Design a protein around this ligand. Structure first.
Ligand SMILES: CCCc1scc2c1-c1nc(SCC(=O)C(C)(C)C)ncc1CC2
Length: 150
């Protein structure tokens, strides 16, 4: 059986892959009440139990997928979890390329880290991250917009 690793990037912000997202017991142990599913094809796990608030960012792992368009919507959901003292899990698939992009963007905007420091911070807690040059380029443009206040 799979040992579910729900990585706490921040005490209320967790990152995982598709198999980590299927462990209901771990999610309730960690006081998680919000889930962001960054895939088009995965089910919203545990949906039928009425335990969590869900948000789907229907993105693919392609070199042309636009994730920047979903940043603000994801940040608003994370902020709602933060304000009510609940944890939020963001997940995609094995290499966590999609979900780690949104986590890093949140750290850049709301923790005021640089892109590099945010990546290193996430990488230290979640060692296995599949690179995506397209998403990396979007984070670099996101950093410049933040540094310019746009
Ligand atoms: C976000 C900046 C990534 C940077 S800045 C300098 C390096 C890297 C880096 N990142 C990765 S994985 C991270 C991603 O690509 C996302 C999360 C977008 C999916 N693999 C290898 C390297 C080599 C060195």
């Amino acid at each position: 059986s799979h040992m579910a690793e729900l990585t706490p990037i921040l005490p209320f912000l967790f990152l995982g892959n598709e198999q980590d997202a299927q462990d209901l017991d771990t999610m309730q142990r960690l006081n998680i009440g919000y889930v962001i599913n960054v895939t088009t094809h995965l089910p919203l796990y545990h949906y039928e139990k009425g335990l969590f608030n869900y948000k789907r960012l229907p993105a693919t792992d392609s070199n042309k997928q636009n994730l920047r368009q979903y940043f603000e919507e994801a940040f608003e959901f994370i902020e709602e979890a933060h304000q009510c003292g609940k944890g939020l899990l963001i997940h995609c698939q094995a290499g966590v390329s999609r979900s780690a992009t949104i986590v890093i963007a949140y750290l850049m905007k709301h923790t005021r880290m640089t892109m590099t420091d945010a990546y290193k911070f996430v990488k230290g807690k979640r060692p296995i991250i599949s690179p995506n040059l397209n998403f990396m380029g979007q984070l670099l443009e996101f950093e410049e917009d933040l540094n310019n206040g746009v």
